Design a protein around this nucleic acid. Structure first.
Ligand SMILES: [Mg+2]
Ligand SMILES: [Mg+2]
Ligand SMILES: [Mg+2]
Ligand SMILES: [Mg+2]
Ligand SMILES: [Mg+2]
Ligand SMILES: [Mg+2]
Ligand SMILES: [Mg+2]
Ligand SMILES: [Mg+2]
Ligand SMILES: [Mg+2]
Ligand SMILES: [Mg+2]
Ligand SMILES: [Mg+2]
Ligand SMILES: [Mg+2]
Ligand SMILES: [Mg+2]
Ligand SMILES: [Mg+2]
Ligand SMILES: [Mg+2]
Ligand SMILES: [Mg+2]
Ligand SMILES: [Mg+2]
Ligand SMILES: [Mg+2]
Ligand SMILES: [Mg+2]
Ligand SMILES: [Mg+2]
Ligand SMILES: [Mg+2]
Ligand SMILES: [Mg+2]
Ligand SMILES: [Mg+2]
Ligand SMILES: [Mg+2]
Ligand SMILES: [Mg+2]
Ligand SMILES: [Mg+2]
Ligand SMILES: [Mg+2]
Ligand SMILES: [Mg+2]
Ligand SMILES: [Mg+2]
Ligand SMILES: [Mg+2]
Ligand SMILES: [Mg+2]
Ligand SMILES: [Mg+2]
Ligand SMILES: [Mg+2]
Ligand SMILES: [Mg+2]
Ligand SMILES: [Mg+2]
Ligand SMILES: [Mg+2]
Ligand SMILES: [Mg+2]
Ligand SMILES: [Mg+2]
Ligand SMILES: [Mg+2]
Ligand SMILES: [Mg+2]
Ligand SMILES: [Mg+2]
Ligand SMILES: [Mg+2]
Ligand SMILES: [Mg+2]
Ligand SMILES: [Mg+2]
Ligand SMILES: [Mg+2]
Ligand SMILES: [Mg+2]
Ligand SMILES: [Mg+2]
Ligand SMILES: [Mg+2]
Ligand SMILES: [Mg+2]
Ligand SMILES: [Mg+2]
Ligand SMILES: [Mg+2]
Lengths: 135, 50, 153, 61, 204, 134
RNA sequence: CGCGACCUCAGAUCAGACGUGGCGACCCGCUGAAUUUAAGCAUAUUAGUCAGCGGAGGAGAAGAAACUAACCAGGAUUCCCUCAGUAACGGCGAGUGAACAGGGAAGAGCCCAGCGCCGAAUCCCCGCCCCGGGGGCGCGGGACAUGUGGCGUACGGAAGACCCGCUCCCCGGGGGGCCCAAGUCCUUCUGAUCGAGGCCCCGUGGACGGUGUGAGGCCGGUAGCGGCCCCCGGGCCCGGGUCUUCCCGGAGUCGGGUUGCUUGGGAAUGCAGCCCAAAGCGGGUGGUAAACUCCAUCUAAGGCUAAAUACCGGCACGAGACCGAUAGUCAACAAGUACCGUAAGGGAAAGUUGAAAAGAACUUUGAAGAGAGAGUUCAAGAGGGCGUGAAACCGUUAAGAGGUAAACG
RNA sequence: CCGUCUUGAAACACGGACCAAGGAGUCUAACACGUGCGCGAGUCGGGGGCUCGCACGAAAGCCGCCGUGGCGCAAUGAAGG
RNA sequence: GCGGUGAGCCUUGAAGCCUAGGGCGCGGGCCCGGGUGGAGCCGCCGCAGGUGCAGAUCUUGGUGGUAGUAGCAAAUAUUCAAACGAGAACUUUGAAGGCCGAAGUGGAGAAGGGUUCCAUGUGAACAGCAGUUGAACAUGGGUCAGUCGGUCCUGAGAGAUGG
RNA sequence: GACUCUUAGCGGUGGAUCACUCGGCUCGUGCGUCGAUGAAGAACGCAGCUAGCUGCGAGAAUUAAUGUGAAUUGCAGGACACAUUGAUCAUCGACACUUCGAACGCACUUGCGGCCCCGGGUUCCUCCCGGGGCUACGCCUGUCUGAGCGUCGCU
């Protein structure tokens, strides 16, 4: 889990927020792996990742990267989409397969939280006040 | 002080070259609206940033 | 405080609302901007009918609305098979296939086959090379009636 | 200007140029795909476009 | 609307009551005239105004369609009466007939010379000279706000189709041109008062 | 009225584009009418004033029929100096009184290759206008 | 006991490339309060909000059903109107609170892995040779059988026969410049007039601005589907229908338990940790936990995608029943300036001579500042912080009065 | 000797030396009733769309059972109904 | 302030301001005369507000009374003559009389200041009297290194890389 | 007669009112563009007389080119016959662009290198001086040089 980074366990105010120990992080351990490979290799593009064994202490993932400037990749349609600038650091905007699952996307009644395209997009729309011209 | 670095001596050189009156021929330009150097510094009253 | 008589109101304004207010003062601006993109698209597709493909007849899906009928997303593959036109030529003709729509009944199957055949007799198909008509249409048919259709097909 | 124009002529068509001779436009614009691999299309995509081209039709009223 | 940040982009705190000054908030720091002088209130120099004008005031009003159509009919019927048209101040003492109907050759006019000559023959030209007499400056702060010149309203030409009739007038001061299929209460009753003098074409 | 939505009508924006206007735009703003002889000898109505034109004043205190040579075009103040529009100051010395070139009238032009070709250009564009009188 | 394959792994100022920082209005991912409200307060609320951290684009995200439904069925996403202050949550208090159908805007669909067949049919690099990357060579290197390319993806697909139909497809308006109608007519005002009379002229132009007041006609412009000028916008190649024989799918994932946050989600809506941990007529969903059984529905654990949508930042424009110099931005001006503070940071005041400098020559008293004459100007009762120039307050002249402080009815 | 709070102010209660200028029941939403108007068992386009080329005009007009929908025309029961 | 309207008003003088001038209205207020002023303004019918001030230890700006008052009193001290000068209690030169009294009121530095250094000129402001003086104002000038310091070294400590 | 009080005229002090407005604010539209090819930012510099603002980079209140067609202007200066072919302003596509800064040899309230090429004193010899070029981290493809009681083969 995620220990809350507060000195000596003293969060301040309101005992619903007194939690330090049993707290959990919102993204998964696989998604934390894809971020750490993408921050180190900034010139590459994170494609996807998988699981190769745990431990009690550690957990190991192999992360598939793509160099977007090699001409075995820029000269291949159906993989040259990742050379577009809108796919830079796509593990940090949370949209590889591992980080996508923490966002609550999906179709149906189980996924009404993200029915604009994210949780913040839905929340923004149902909390603006539409003041038309002819109220 | 007498012991100073080079980039402080050059900082003090800029601040005493702009510590100067306005030229008298400036006042005769068309659309003047300026009459004295309003940002003139004195060593005894207003100290420098440095 | 409640004063004497009236509703127990619960107004939803406890949540810093005036930071998020969508005014509508660009409303006549965007009715003009949308309308200038209808007029611009309709002259890009110059005899093609200004509104997109033909849409099927679709029965509305609940007990409140099943007496009325509307236009759907597209024609099912079973309607395309028995009207006898391929599912990959049909978008090039303006028919709009919908591949995930089932046909549970027969007379709603037949009403869209009848719609498809009546469309196919009605559209005018120009040849690829205008200097050499292969199978499309007669050149007299393409002259006095080659106008763009307005509104839905 | 005479010196720089001679160098532009010297590297007219060599494989690699100095960085101050090759064009400046914008850092982001130098990263985009050039005009040949922008319009490369696969064989599965270019078989679909000869078999099923967009037709020119009209619908009479 | 006034700016959302106006009067609040200062750091200011009240001082309390040990000091013998009022308990209004005061600008902090030192060294300038601004320091320790009042802030944030509507009574403070350079403060926020009271109830700052928001942009979501209800600017627009809707009127029922039957009520808008009945303002038109009441405005057209008031302009067939010579008393109500003259009380609106128009110079129709030599106009041959109300409602004044001219024939559809007028709709294909091109030049302003033949346009003015039409209004002189129909004796509707003294009404244009009351517009030229009334051209003066507006009084007030409108002159800084692009509303410098004011003038009288003149006649209202009402046509069926444009074949040149808009370009032919368009330049005579105080001439409103209405298409008959799209009539407007803001132009057939200026100021809210009935009885604008209207000139009709025969097809309209 | 103005129908172009791209040219403005705003009083404070038209004054701003007039008072600090660049000096080749000030040259067009500092134009002047031609005389009645020169409007029909040429076909041009008005022409931007030049260093050595001859001109006469039609408004103000120095109004009269004396012909004066332009002696300086002071585009910084939108004003021109003519040889005999003078007054003497307290010293006894004499200064020129600047007057705005919209209040003078060019009685002869100072011609050269550039002022010919822009004087045939302003004559051609009227002839395209006078054939549209149909 | 060396030589050589490969595998793992090092070092280079190796040959060629790429990332880092900024901005951040809007966008995505995290992290995440407390004022406050509950008339106290601890759950709730404030609020998935401020602040904090990361990452983008001209939009972004989302997206072609592991969907909605239960009907005579709809059919990717996004946005609008409505559903609706409703179902539901809630010290069931305060408060909170969606979705589906319906109507619109826009509309577009696709690709792998796998399974298989095709003599790896594939890609990068280098060298030479022909066009301004193309094309062609190399007993040239290398990647790659630990799997590149073609065909092909759930809407089925393939291979065979059989019937039928043919001649393909792709690639090599905008910007800028200069111009275009008509009174300085007569008379009279004025310091000057763009005024006031009179006689008009242009009008597809009577918008606005400048000009010594107030201008369609003096000047720039304005109007015009007005003009002229310059500049930019070889490759590749069968398809369909029937029939037989075959081929069919993503795992420490689903799912279950439990803990924590979250949600309208209520015997658990989503997300995460940890433990357990799959199946193949299976799996998911079918808003009350469970067993049983019919039925419907979709195909999760891989990927791409325009439009409709957002925009307090940027570049560039246009407008206003807005403000008019203590107002409007803090800033109409040498303003984030002077100044203050070690620093983080805080942060002003200040517009107007006149049409034109014509900015007072000269004389005279004084050491000078300052005066007196003289002069400019329509005006110095406009003299360089100078338009107008109020009051508080002060000097002076004039008039009236004065030992219960003035003032007042 | 005025403003103020107060049972009670000339007060030995508080604030006020003087003058100018600024200075405080606003706007949005939701209700309730009262009043004016239009239509009337209906009513309303509010969203969208259509209309010489956008001075005014970001206005105005039009749609058709685009009337989808809101409210109203039927109540009661926790619910089957 | 906006839509209308007064063939409204105005350089033959608008607004504004002033007024022992004339009046009107119960009043809110208004009209007229006069003076000053120098370019715009107002009436009716509607429309819209950031719409009326004596107060808030109200905000900002100005100004009084107090008041020519408190004051210009810590560390013993001045005087005569001359010079320059419009002008001398305060400048300079001389003469006297004195004080710091070598742990200085002396002679040099480190921090810190930043041109104050040095000439000449001014005589408005500033130096809380005054100045012919100045650390003020103006105009010029001035800091020279193989050996004197920095630079180099490590100290308490600070700090990347591998992890 | 002073003083004080009241009122007016005139004179001050003061800067309200009024008129003005190259400024804001608000709404809308169209675009929607930074950077290792050195950005944003900062420093110092640059004019005949020049402090600030503004513009600019040792080519420094700008060079070229193109359009424009006689100025700029506070003073001076000398220009430019305007075709022996161009003043000025605008545009801007050519060229230039000091130091710091992601900031790039290492370091920084300071300073010291290393490598290669060129020049000068040398008269290849590499000591001195000047000049030029390179010398950051991460990472990809490829190359070269390796390492292993890793897996093996042939000896
Ligand atoms: Mg709580
Ligand atoms: Mg999961
Ligand atoms: Mg000091
Ligand atoms: Mg549509
Ligand atoms: Mg393929
Ligand atoms: Mg006024
Ligand atoms: Mg970044
Ligand atoms: Mg409470
Ligand atoms: Mg309370
Ligand atoms: Mg409390
Ligand atoms: Mg919450
Ligand atoms: Mg934040
Ligand atoms: Mg996207
Ligand atoms: Mg849906
Ligand atoms: Mg309701
Ligand atoms: Mg909530
Ligand atoms: Mg394969
Ligand atoms: Mg003209
Ligand atoms: Mg004018
Ligand atoms: Mg005009
Ligand atoms: Mg909650
Ligand atoms: Mg159930
Ligand atoms: Mg996507
Ligand atoms: Mg001011
Ligand atoms: Mg002021
Ligand atoms: Mg201000
Ligand atoms: Mg004022
Ligand atoms: Mg006067
Ligand atoms: Mg005056
Ligand atoms: Mg004035
Ligand atoms: Mg003044
Ligand atoms: Mg004036
Ligand atoms: Mg004055
Ligand atoms: Mg007396
Ligand atoms: Mg009491
Ligand atoms: Mg009392
Ligand atoms: Mg008592
Ligand atoms: Mg009290
Ligand atoms: Mg008191
Ligand atoms: Mg007031
Ligand atoms: Mg009612
Ligand atoms: Mg107002
Ligand atoms: Mg007051
Ligand atoms: Mg005394
Ligand atoms: Mg002693
Ligand atoms: Mg000493
Ligand atoms: Mg000493
Ligand atoms: Mg003194
Ligand atoms: Mg000295
Ligand atoms: Mg007096
Ligand atoms: Mg003033």
């Amino acid at each position: 889990g995620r220990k809350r980074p507060v000195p000596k366990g003293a969060t301040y105010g309101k005992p619903v927020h007194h939690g330090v120990n049993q707290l959990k992080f919102a993204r998964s351990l696989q998604s934390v792996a894809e971020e750490r490979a993408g921050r180190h290799c900034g010139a590459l593009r994170v494609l996807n990742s998988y699981w190769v064994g745990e431990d009690s202490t550690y957990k190991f993932f192999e992360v598939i990267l793509i160099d977007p400037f090699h001409k075995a990749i820029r000269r291949n349609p159906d993989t040259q989409w990742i050379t577009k600038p809108v796919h830079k650091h796509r593990e940090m905007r949370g949209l590889t397969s591992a980080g996508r699952k923490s966002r609550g996307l999906g179709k149906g009644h189980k996924f009404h939280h993200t029915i604009g395209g994210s949780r913040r997009a839905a929340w923004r729309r149902r909390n603006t006040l539409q003041l038309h011209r002819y109220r | 002080s007498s012991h100073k670095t080079f980039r402080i001596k050059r900082f003090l050189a800029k601040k005493q070259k702009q510590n100067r009156p306005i030229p008298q021929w400036i006042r005769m330009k068309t659309g003047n609206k300026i009459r004295y150097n309003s940002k003139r510094r004195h060593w005894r009253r207003t100290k420098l940033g440095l | 405080a409640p004063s004497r008589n009236g509703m127990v109101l619960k107004p939803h304004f406890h949540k810093d609302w005036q930071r998020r207010v969508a005014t509508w003062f660009n409303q006549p601006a965007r009715k003009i901007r949308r309308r200038k993109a209808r007029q611009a698209k309709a002259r890009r597709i110059a005899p093609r009918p200004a509104s997109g493909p033909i849409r099927p007849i679709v029965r509305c899906p609940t007990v409140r609305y099943h007496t009325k009928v509307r236009a759907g997303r597209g024609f099912s593959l079973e309607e395309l098979r028995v009207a006898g036109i391929h599912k990959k030529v049909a978008r090039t003709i303006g028919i709009s296939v919908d591949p995930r729509r089932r046909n549970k009944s027969t007379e709603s199957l037949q009403a869209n086959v009848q719609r498809l055949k009546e469309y196919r007799s009605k559209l005018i198909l120009f040849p690829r090379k205008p200097s050499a008509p292969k199978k499309g249409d007669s050149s007299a048919e393409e002259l006095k009636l080659a106008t763009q259709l307005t509104g839905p097909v | 200007q005479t010196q720089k124009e001679n160098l532009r002529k010297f590297y007219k068509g060599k494989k690699y140029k100095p960085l101050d001779l090759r064009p400046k436009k914008t850092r982001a614009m130098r990263r985009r795909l050039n005009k040949h691999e922008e319009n490369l299309k696969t064989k599965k995509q270019q078989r679909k476009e000869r078999l099923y081209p967009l037709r020119k039709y009209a619908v009479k009223a | 609307a006034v700016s959302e940040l106006a009067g609040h982009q200062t750091s200011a705190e009240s001082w309390g009551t040990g000091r013998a000054v009022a308990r209004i908030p005061r600008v902090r720091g030192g060294g300038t005239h601004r320091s320790g002088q009042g802030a944030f209130g509507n009574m403070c120099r350079g403060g926020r105004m009271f109830a700052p004008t928001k942009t979501w005031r209800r600017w627009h009003r809707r009127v029922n369609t039957t009520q808008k159509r009945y303002a038109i009919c009441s405005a057209l019927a008031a302009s067939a009466l010579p008393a109500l048209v003259m009380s609106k101040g128009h110079r129709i003492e030599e106009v041959p007939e109300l409602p004044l109907v001219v024939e559809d050759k007028v709709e294909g006019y091109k030049k302003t010379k033949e346009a003015v000559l039409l209004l002189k023959k129909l004796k509707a030209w003294n009404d244009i000279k009351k517009v030229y007499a009334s051209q003066r400056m507006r009084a007030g702060k409108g002159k800084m706000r692009n509303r410098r010149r004011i003038q009288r309203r003149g006649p209202c030409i009402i046509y069926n189709e444009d074949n040149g009739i808009i370009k032919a007038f368009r330049n005579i001061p105080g001439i409103t041109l209405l298409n008959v299929s799209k009539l407007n209460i803001l132009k057939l009753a200026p100021g809210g008062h009935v009885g604008r003098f209207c000139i009709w074409t025969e097809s309209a | 009225m103005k129908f172009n939505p791209f040219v403005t009508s705003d009083r404070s924006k038209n004054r701003k584009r007039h008072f600090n206007a660049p000096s080749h735009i000030r040259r067009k703003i500092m134009s002047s009418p031609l005389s009645k002889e020169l409007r029909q000898k040429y076909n041009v109505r008005s022409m931007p004033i030049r260093k050595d034109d001859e001109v006469q004043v039609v408004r103000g205190h120095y109004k009269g029929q004396q012909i004066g040579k332009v002696v300086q075009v002071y585009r910084k103040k939108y004003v021109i100096y003519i040889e005999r529009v003078q007054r003497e100051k307290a010293n006894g010395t004499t200064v020129h009184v600047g007057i705005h070139p919209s209040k003078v009238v060019i009685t002869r032009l100072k011609l050269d290759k550039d002022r010919k070709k822009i004087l045939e250009r302003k004559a051609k564009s009227r002839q395209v206008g006078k054939e549209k009188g149909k």
